[PDB]
């Protein structure tokens, strides 16, 4: 070790594994010092560290002792070299036919357990093929290990071709069989061939109607049924229908193939069909990008953005247009923080023509001006009137029941659907803040609220029922899009506290704390367990009769609400395990009140429990201001985790 | 009758031709004129027997599966209620072979070309049956394992899943919160089938909710514990994978997985698997310990060749979490939670707490193992300084009260001192010169080892197990405690006592002088 000849030292350990003359603590110490040397520099010492560790582990197994942590660390990335060196140390130190049954059984069980810890199955063969492994255990459990480990990751094969009993005796059999293949078909070229032969066999029968599950929008039905050629019309209809159906079932590649085939087909004889199909291809590319290419926060390939910009500035009246394509384009712009274009580069006529573009421009303007104290208001206002006019009723009448007679540029259902297409967090939270500001005019805490006006015009015309529907839907959707969003959990908990769903309110306050803290591992930041939030979970506990929880939650505040804590502790109709939760009370005054409360009621056992709870050196009020704070925060954490278990 | 009578051979071929014509005519009637949809009374009575039809199709007889599977597809396309997901769910809950399962994929392919969202509805139908008295737990475990088969078959995606477009893993990804109660399901078939599914079923692409994550981790650790009590080391794989994947969702998921595992393991239940006091075989304890240490190191190691002999670095944050949960479980009062070490005169002030820590260590040998795991990350052992000082004080008191002329009459205390010194030196809280001291513990009378442990206490007073003394070496990514830079970190005055002990017992400690040299 002084001279650095570590290989012969590893050989000494291998040989001593036979004799056990070297001390085990000596082996541990040299292993530690070798690892310390490897941690500083001399990267070649990592191999020596594994070698001495493997020898130590094999000896420990022979002496019937546990497997070291470094042994599993070194097999976190199993290698042929590592595992073979371990196996040869295993074989060279076992001393077969003279090791007795103890060494053999221990060492064979170690071989099993090192087989178990391998992520790669071929590693588990090349141990199971090791001679010591085959000699050590038995002649019957090896196949058991191999088969029980094979079904760990068994290979699954599933026929994807739907069965077909295509037994061609009559023409009806053939026509139905080819219809079955076409409907089971997913590739555009096979569809084209099937339709060509179907037209060849028949005289004048169309073939776009051999399946009612194929669907085409009505805005395109007039322009798609006007094709003079029967076969071309049939093929275009089938390609559109199956492309849309594949888009519904998230079969992106097949839909793209069908769409490319129809697109290259329709260029020869129709410009209107070509333009409609370019719009469809743009929509498919947007959806495919957002589904597969997105899902992790990566920018568009900048060519989809150019196509979206061209489609927004298209302005062609002859082409049939789908409002869903424009809505998806606006959502695509809003999700990838393309605020500059929607704010400045958007054409003027598009705002007055498409309400979706106007709403997107307003949202981009109100999101890009957030750092501005007064500049933000100039657009947050206009957004406020446009949204409140959307959620208003002109002239018993209900916005949800009618879905008309609204003063806004969009229906409430259309507004909700458009918001549902947005994933960008800033836009989503701005919409949440706007609708929450609409919720409390005629509470709940949600971020950027002072940027919207308070006084509103035509308060009576505002159907607040539709507004409340929209806000509950939006909070649940946002909690779905980011389950680990603490502020949204606070919003939902405030809602449930307002709706007297005090259990669900407590539960969502706890989710918010588990997000801010790490399941209440840390002190939950006071900006989220505010005095409001903590007092509302207090009130939820009170109204669920979780009164001792009220007491523990009363001290969670900046000032311990001794009034509400003592009021709740006085309650005897409790569903919160009064005596089991006094440990969570770090406050001496609350526990003293508990002592007097239990003494006056004759509860000798509870009085003794509370007295012992006070009689703690850590809870002494004379502690030097650090023991008490640590005890208070640890009781906060453990009480919040008990609430987590009792509520989620 | 017609199917059974399609297999007088003139009547048999008349019936085969009849069934071919009937399948093709039903294909015409089910879905045509795409104007109310066509009504098939034949299939209108078959929606009442779609489950029985699936059962006869899963029989997979020469031609019966072809004919009856085509008929199930036509029933699914025909029935406006779309029994296609119902058929798929009954297949999944009653298919017994990968070809019986292949019937489901063929049905979906024959239906995905005409229907949408079939698998999610099949899954929810099966699970609604499951959590009720329906789909009796054999059927439940069948559906669980068949959905696991589907999820994996998509996950090993080839032409099958791609042309199918099933999204089996993604479709099951939204049903995580139903399989977790099935982890708590009393039927171990159901429990472990849900364990397998959740282990491989991808988590929500957005995130895992504090409720979702907490319940999933609770059920995963519950599966781990029940299967470790029941099945042993080889039987925790699905719960372990589910828990580790839950750990990789977020640092909150990691710490939740580890803390639930710790609380359940240090619980009075699940403790006989691990040498905990209140006769058990030692081999099974050793290899259960290896099992959860493997799970712990898998969760703790930073994911992601760094040489063929190197090992992944354990995250100091995960080992710090292990240290803090260790401290909470063993020494909860933490009246002396400060990491630096107080004067040895304070030991008599906290005799009860330190004796409680020593008794907890004696009852549970697994505590030392977690100490070594924490010491694997250099900065993490600083947070164990309370437990280290308590164990050191308990050992010091025992050696004060040890009247034996040697130390072999107190095996537990001797090994506890040796292992405590080894843990402290491994975490680089002691210099190597003062860390080789545990080897000569066995050849010393109690007062020499007491003075030696007092020297350890003195060194940890002068230096202190503080994370800020650990400089993060970015070249290798591991924190390094440089005792040379600390000043007197090689035990300047602390090695004097050790050398005096060596000199006094030189007749027995002569050959060990090489472990305490200055370099």
Curated annotation (Swiss-Prot), chain A:
Mark the TPR repeats by their residue spans.
Answer: 1-24, 236-269, 486-519
State the UniProt keywords alphabetically: Chromosome, Disease variant, Intellectual disability, Nucleus, Phosphoprotein, Repeat, TPR repeat
Coiled coil location? none
Q: Does the keyword Transmembrane apply?
A: no
Its GO biological process annotations read: protein localization to chromatin; regulation of transcription elongation by RNA polymerase II; RNA polymerase II transcription initiation surveillance; snRNA 3'-end processing; snRNA processing
* Keyword RNA-binding part of the UniProt annotation: no
Q: What cellular component terms from Gene Ontology apply here?
A: chromatin; INTAC complex; integrator complex; nucleoplasm; nucleus
Give the domain note. Answer: The WFEF motif is required for the recruitment of protein phosphatase 2A (PP2A) to transcription pause-release checkpoint.
Family from the record: Belongs to the Integrator subunit 8 family.
| Record note on quaternary structure | Component of the Integrator complex, composed of core subunits INTS1, INTS2, INTS3, INTS4, INTS5, INTS6, INTS7, INTS8, INTS9/RC74, INTS10, INTS11/CPSF3L, INTS12, INTS13, INTS14 and INTS15. The core complex associates with protein phosphatase 2A subunits PPP2CA and PPP2R1A, to form the Integrator-PP2A (INTAC) complex.
Record function comment:
Component of the integrator complex, a multiprotein complex that terminates RNA polymerase II (Pol II) transcription in the promoter-proximal region of genes.
State what protein this is by name: Integrator complex subunit 8
Q: Please state the gene responsible for encoding this protein.
A: INTS8
Curated annotation (Swiss-Prot), chain B:
Is the keyword Membrane assigned to this protein? yes
Q: Where in the cell is it found?
A: Nucleus; Cytoplasm; Nucleus membrane
Sorted alphabetically, the keyword list is: Acetylation, Cytoplasm, Membrane, Nucleus, Phosphoprotein, Transmembrane, Transmembrane helix
The record's Gene Ontology biological-process terms are:
regulation of transcription elongation by RNA polymerase II; RNA polymerase II transcription initiation surveillance; snRNA 3'-end processing; snRNA processing
Q: Which GO terms describe its cellular component?
A: cytoplasm; cytosol; INTAC complex; integrator complex; membrane; nuclear membrane; nucleoplasm; nucleus
Q: Where are the transmembrane segments?
A: 103-123, 366-386, 440-460
Respond yes or no to whether keyword Nucleus is given for this record.
yes
Q: How does it sit in the membrane?
A: Multi-pass membrane protein
Protein family (similarity comment): Belongs to the Integrator subunit 5 family.
Q: What does this protein do?
A: Component of the integrator complex, a multiprotein complex that terminates RNA polymerase II (Pol II) transcription in the promoter-proximal region of genes.
Record text on subunit structure and interactions: Component of the Integrator complex, composed of core subunits INTS1, INTS2, INTS3, INTS4, INTS5, INTS6, INTS7, INTS8, INTS9/RC74, INTS10, INTS11/CPSF3L, INTS12, INTS13, INTS14 and INTS15. The core complex associates with protein phosphatase 2A subunits PPP2CA and PPP2R1A, to form the Integrator-PP2A (INTAC) complex.
Q: What is this protein called?
A: Integrator complex subunit 5
Q: List the source organism.
A: Homo sapiens (Human)
What part of the full protein is here?
409 to 1009 of 1019
